[PDB]
Amino acid sequence: AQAVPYYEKAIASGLQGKDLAECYLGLGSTFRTLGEYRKAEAVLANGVKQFPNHQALRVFYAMVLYNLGRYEQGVELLLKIIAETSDDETIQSYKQAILFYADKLDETWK
Amino acid sequence: AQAVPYYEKAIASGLQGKDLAECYLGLGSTFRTLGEYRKAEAVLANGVKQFPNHQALRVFYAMVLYNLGRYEQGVELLLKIIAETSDDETIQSYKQAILFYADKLDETWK
Numbered sequence: 664a665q666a667v668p669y670y671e672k673a674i675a676s677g678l679q680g681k682d683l684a685e686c687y688l689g690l691g692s693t694f695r696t697l698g699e700y701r702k703a704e705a706v707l708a709n710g711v712k713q714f715p716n717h718q719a720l721r722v723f724y725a726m727v728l729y730n731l732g733r734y735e736q737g738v739e740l741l742l743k744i745i746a747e748t749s750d751d752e753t754i755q756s757y758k759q760a761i762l763f764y765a766d767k768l769d770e771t772w773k
Numbered sequence: 774a775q776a777v778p779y780y781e782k783a784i785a786s787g788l789q790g791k792d793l794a795e796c797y798l799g800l801g802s803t804f805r806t807l808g809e810y811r812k813a814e815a816v817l818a819n820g821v822k823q824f825p826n827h828q829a830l831r832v833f834y835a836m837v838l839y840n841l842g843r844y845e846q847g848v849e850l851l852l853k854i855i856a857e858t859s860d861d862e863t864i865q866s867y868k869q870a871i872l873f874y875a876d877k878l879d880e881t882w883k
Contacts, residue, residue, distance in 0.1 A: 664882065684863075692870070698881035719863035722855060722871060725848070729878055734844045738835070741851035745832060749858045753794075753829035760802070761832060768839055771808035772774065 664693045684714045691723055700730040718744055739765045774803045794824045801833055810840040828854055849875045 670690035678686065687710030695703035707724040714720060721744055728737030742765040746758050754761070780800035788796065797820030805813035817834040824830060831854055838847030852875040856868050864871070 688867075696874075696880075696882050717863050718859065718861040719867045722852065722864060722867070726852070726874060726878060729844065729848045734839065734848075737848060738839045738844075738851065741848065741855065742832065742836070744855055744859070744864075745851065748861045748864065749828065749854070750860055751828040751858045753827050754832060754854075754858065757798075757829045757832070764806075764836060768836060770806075772806050 664696065666690075666693045667697075680714075684710060684717045684720065687713070688717075688720050688723055691720075691727070695723070695727050695730060700727055703727045704731060718748055735768060738768060774806065776800075776803045777807075790824075794820060794827045794830065797823070798827075798830050798833055801830075801837070805833070805837050805840060810837055813837045814841060828858055845878060848878060 667690065670686045670693065673686045674683065674690070687706055691703045691707035691710065694700075694706060697703075704724070704727045707720060707727055710717065710720040711724055721740055725737045725740045725744070728734075728740065742761050745754060746761040746765070749755065777800065780796045780803065783796045784793065784800070797816055801813045801817035801820065804810075804816060807813075814834070814837045817830060817837055820827065820830040821834055831850055835847045835850045835854070838844075838850065852871050855864060856871040856875070859865065
């Protein structure tokens, strides 16, 4: 994508709720798919910071975290997203378990 | 958990839909939390094989995949679960993107 300038300019301009959120996500993804994982991380962190309730941005941040090799943090985040937003009866039955294990994946009982 | 025998015996006995699914998940988690990731993987693979529509089991398989260091496969699976089951408007707007990037996370454009 030659889309970085598009999204840059778009952001460098009055922009709000959906509108701006989507340009951060857009830019982030473009950077990530360009292989510019650090640049992607900066942009997407900024989006999550500004639109903490925008789940798609968290999903994309997770994808970056993967590419950067921050596996634990990425899996944590995807599990938290699943727990907080899943339709599925079975997942909601285990919601508390999922949320609990999410920041403790490396832990084990004796 | 001293729960392995509980779940073993339970499974080694007539058992169906919810009933059995939950014992596989149960056993798997117990094994995983015990640090017996290979044992956890076997059990949970079996559950996903038998109850392919049971999303919780896929989440737990993902957690194991993480512990085994099969990060790509685990993140793929969590992204597929999010894409297939999320309430959130924003995530459903990007559903196709998420599903697309899920088995291609290491790829980049030139």
